[PDB]
Design a protein around this ligand. Structure first.
Ligand code: MG
Ligand code: MG
Ligand code: MG
Ligand code: MG
Ligand code: MG
Ligand code: MG
Ligand code: MG
Ligand code: MG
Ligand code: MG
Ligand code: MG
Ligand code: MG
Lengths: 88, 73, 101, 119
RNA sequence: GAAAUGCGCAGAUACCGGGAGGAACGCCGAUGGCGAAGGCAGCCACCUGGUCCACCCGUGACGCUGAGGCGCGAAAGCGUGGGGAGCAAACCGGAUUAGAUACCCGGGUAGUCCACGCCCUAAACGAUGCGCGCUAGGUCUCUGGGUCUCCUGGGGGCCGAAGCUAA
């Protein structure tokens, strides 16, 4: 799975400031954690079509927060992606 | 009506996840080997669910019976 | 690491020497698979509710272990390989759930 | 005349016939009988009179081998399942127990169409 | 219904013991639960989705819906392997009948099962698109929280205010 301190190293890795639990940057990061896990899971379990719906929604959620962050500070946007390795 | 012995009462402070406690578990099996109804264990819905899983582990271990046999007819 | 409980039913009919050999292979099997052994209890042999392996009794074991999750199925696999190991049941542990208390 | 004294009687009750087997305390049959054995032919065999006659025949047949007591084992839900037991009791055989052991799967084999219908 | 095909002296039915194998999970079990739907039920472990409550911590309208697209989609059916207990279209018999290409009975192939790949349908039904707000209550229930009589959420039912409806 993904453990508390596993997760923690990601929130602190991305918070705009100490105690920032819920900024766009933090969320788009946390999802990419969950997405890569899921897609790793479905490369094995290609028939777990139920879980696959999960992935379609995480992705839909990611590119939705991304679509916002790019409309707000296209700096932080091109910044998040280079950090996470997406859009490419 | 129809209220004779309810099995929750006629017992003490037992654990329900304990699959090794044959002498407490076998009180919830019928005269045959069957898991009893709630209207006969007097358990809560969540309680029965757990006893139901516990009894099954006990049967796999050979402590409780899967089935028995009626002795009057 | 999760906390499990390993049940082992044993051939009720072996002696001190074939038992002490089995328990050996059981704790060595554990060692090789990550099993840090918390508390244990050899409850011994009881009357089976139904004959297992044509015996009407079975010798019982029980280990409470912390061990790697990804290794539990092999640990149980390896344990069943033996011949006087009649049953293996590996449950993951749970907080008890009192009732009528 | 192999001498046994006590043993088991199996009643196999069914809708189409009743059928009684007597065995030694280990389950090897001593003697048996049924609705056809007592000269019935068609649907008459499952009648409860047949089960009386059949049970009584397999008792008399068994008291020759010297039976005296019997554990009874009902098996089935036929007509005259019970008229077979009544016969065994009134017969000169100690009926020390009656146990129903009708076999029943833990949902197992797809039944014949006759036997499933409205689920 | 009554029967007859059928099986049985190469010893069946009934009964005890041993073995093989395929399929399905009795009770619990429902008025219960999960899921977007189709659907989901022995037990255990692993991998993985959704969801609900409390805290009121963080972001600051990031929302809703959605033509095309894409994925999913019971059963039957298709391809290639495999498997094949029980069941059973077609088919082969026995009966029934005025006839009986049928209902009843004895057999039985595909199929049902597995893997992979197609098919894309249905009384795919609540015959009720999704989301949000507003408008009496009573009561049974599943699952959280609280000061636990009761209060407050989330779900499943029933009766009913206002109102709606051709009914
Ligand atoms: Mg706040
Ligand atoms: Mg602010
Ligand atoms: Mg389909
Ligand atoms: Mg199919
Ligand atoms: Mg095929
Ligand atoms: Mg058939
Ligand atoms: Mg037929
Ligand atoms: Mg409600
Ligand atoms: Mg409610
Ligand atoms: Mg009105
Ligand atoms: Mg009217």
């Amino acid at each position: 799975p993904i453990t508390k301190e596993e997760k923690q190293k990601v929130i602190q890795e991305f918070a705009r400031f100490p105690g920032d639990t819920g900024s766009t940057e933090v969320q788009v990061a946390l999802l990419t954690l969950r997405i890569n896990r899921l897609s790793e899971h479905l490369k094995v379990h290609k028939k777990d079509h139920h879980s696959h719906r999960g992935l379609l929604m995480m992705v839909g959620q990611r590119r939705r927060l991304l679509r916002y962050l790019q409309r707000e500070d296209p700096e932080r946007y091109r910044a998040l992606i280079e950090k996470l390795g997406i859009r490419g | 009506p129809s209220r004779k012995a309810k099995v929750k009462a006629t017992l003490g402070e037992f654990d329900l996840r304990d699959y090794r406690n044959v002498e407490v578990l076998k009180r919830f099996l019928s005269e045959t080997g069957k898991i009893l109804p709630r209207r006969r264990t007097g358990l809560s819905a969540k309680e029965q669910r757990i006893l139901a899983k516990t009894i099954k582990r006990a049967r796999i271990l050979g402590l409780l019976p899967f089935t028995e046999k009626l002795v009057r007819k | 690491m999760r906390r499990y409980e390993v049940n082992i039913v044993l051939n009720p009919n072996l002696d001190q020497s074939q038992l002490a050999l089995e328990k050996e292979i059981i704790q060595r099997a554990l060692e090789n698979y990550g099993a840090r052994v918390e508390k244990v209890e050899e409850l011994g042999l009881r009357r089976l509710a139904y004959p297992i392996a044509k015996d009407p009794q079975g010798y019982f074991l029980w280990y409470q272990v912390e061990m790697p999750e990804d290794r539990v199925n092999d640990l149980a696999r390896e344990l069943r390989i033996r011949d006087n190991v009649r049953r293996v049941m590996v449950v993951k542990s749970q907080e008890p759930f009192l009732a009528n208390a | 005349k192999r001498q046994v004294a006590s043993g088991r009687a199996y009643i196999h009750a069914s809708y189409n016939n009743t059928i009684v087997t007597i065995t030694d305390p280990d389950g090897n049959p001593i003697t048996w009988s049924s609705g056809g054995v007592i000269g019935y032919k068609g649907s008459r065999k499952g009648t409860p009179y047949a089960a009386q006659l059949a049970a009584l025949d397999a008792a008399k047949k068994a008291m020759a081998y010297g039976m005296q007591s019997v554990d009874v084992i009902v098996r089935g839900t036929g007509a005259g399942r019970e008229q077979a037991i009544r016969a065994l009791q009134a017969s000169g055989l100690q009926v020390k127990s009656i146990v129903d052991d009708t076999p029943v799967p833990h949902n197992g084999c797809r039944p014949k169409k006759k036997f499933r219908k409205a689920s």
